[PDB]
Design a protein around this ligand. Structure first.
Ligand SMILES: [Fe+3]
Ligand SMILES: [Fe+3]
Ligand SMILES: [Fe+3]
Ligand SMILES: [Fe+3]
Ligand SMILES: [Hg+2]
Ligand SMILES: [Hg+2]
Ligand SMILES: [Hg+2]
Ligand SMILES: [Hg+2]
Lengths: 168, 168, 168, 168
């Protein structure tokens, strides 16, 4: 094993290899970002919001890869599936898909925390609490807020046009 | 009595112990402020306005406590009643309740001015005029304007969204 | 349930609504602060120390309210009970009551942490460790030191006068 | 009468000619200020405190002289009586005499306010409330505080020496 490896169970190492999910989350949001720059969609505020979301998921994946190396695990990269859905529809329908996605990632993150806790890895539980679970709750609450605000503004038409601008 | 007490009636001293009313009004606005940060409400402009209102009612109570000590009275702190509701409805409904609350505090402040006048305490009538009654009238006028503007913008829907931005 | 709620058990949500206990603590220390500005007490250093304590305790409560909303729980505000006393005695007696109130809050916060651990909510255990338990131990240690310093300086008379200046 | 006098009653004009009382209080504090600079007293903080008090009482008299002229009345100066004592005792005893004199002046001001109210002179009641009664209550609270602090420090000996310093 690695000269650095210590108290790092093979179950966590393989669970970390979550990297693929973060990269998938990054790619969903990249799809969303450029869907909204379409000449027949033209929602630059949503575009910028999802471009940033895509960058952050990719960084989240890179922190996990860096963590793999710190502990002596070995990174195994797999293919990144494309989103099954290309036409995200309205801004509200994209936000509802992002909420669900943000929410599947956080379940995965909470499952990896339970694995880490069961195998008495406090370095891993600390990482997850400080670098991931905190960000995930903020992101989910934010998107919820955005959904509520867009339904108030009027999920389609003028309210969608005005909500996009406060988002730019 | 206190070595500093002079021309200070025990009825005014009891009426000042108004301190409880200000703290309650501060507690109503704190309730409103965080209600507007719910993920299913998300009115960040209403939230801020009522966060500022809550701080500045609490400062009102502290100026009364300091006054109590200045004149040689003794501060008796009572329980702060829970705010009359959990949920405050629309932003319009919350402005209406704040208007009702502001006029109730004004009426209490005017009654304390009458007691102070009746017992020939010009230092108290000065306090109430310069530090409370002026700002109460200004506050009541502000909230009334805001109610008129929000009814104009359309008390619900896009108008509430756009009026909230104004207020942020 | 809220669109954002996940892994948020109803017992933790009820226990968070700790908010009331924070607000009560804020109200005890506000009572202390203005007691020490009485013309027959005049301890401006103690007064400043407890004004600041009262601000901090109200901020802790607001962070619990902001937290209740992040997780999708609902804030249920409560009456704030009067401080058990009008008058707090010597500066030492006020410090001793504060130490005891700080330990009572710490026990409550430890109990909330237990229930959060038992229901496998690491986002909430992180909140409690990073935002409350650390500060709580530092505050208790601080008041311990002060009690020791004030007994050394001579809890009454000139020593209390000199200790108070060091606190201003 | 003057080209300016309007709603100015003769008994208020004679009550303002308070000028003499302010000048006497100024002279008392001038006596205290230099008493505390005697080589066998040597209390520079008390000395500075009373120097400033004497300056401020003189300004109060001057504002009344200006006020007399503003209203069309005529200033009649009278003999300024000597302070009743050459020597003021301990620091505590000087503060007690000053408290007594602050309350005698305050009472005189309150009687002039009643006179002004009975003759429906709101210009003069505003003068009194804003330029004298407010500063008078603050002065009395301050001196009250100082007396309690000095008794706490230990009205004589080391405590008197330390308290004078915090006053410097
Ligand atoms: Fe992520
Ligand atoms: Fe107020
Ligand atoms: Fe706290
Ligand atoms: Fe004066
Ligand atoms: Hg593991
Ligand atoms: Hg009264
Ligand atoms: Hg729980
Ligand atoms: Hg008069």
């Amino acid at each position: 094993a690695s000269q650095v490896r210590q108290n790092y169970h093979e179950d966590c190492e393989a669970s970390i290899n979550q990297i693929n999910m973060e990269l998938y989350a990054s790619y969903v949001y990249l799809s969303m970002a450029y869907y909204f720059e379409r000449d027949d969609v033209a929602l630059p505020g949503f575009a910028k919001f999802f471009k940033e979301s895509s960058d952050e998921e990719r960084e989240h994946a890179q922190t996990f890869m860096k963590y793999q190396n710190k502990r002596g695990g070995r990174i195994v990269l797999q293919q990144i599936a494309a989103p099954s859905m290309r036409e995200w529809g309205t801004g509200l329908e994209a936000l509802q898909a992002a909420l669900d996605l943000e929410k599947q990632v956080n379940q995965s993150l909470l499952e990896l925390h339970s694995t880490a806790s069961g195998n008495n890895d406090p370095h891993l539980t600390k990482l997850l609490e400080d670098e991931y679970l905190e960000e995930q709750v903020d992101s989910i609450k934010k998107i919820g807020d955005m959904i509520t605000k867009l339904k108030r503004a009027g999920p389609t038409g003028l309210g969608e046009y005005m909500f996009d601008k406060e988002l730019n």
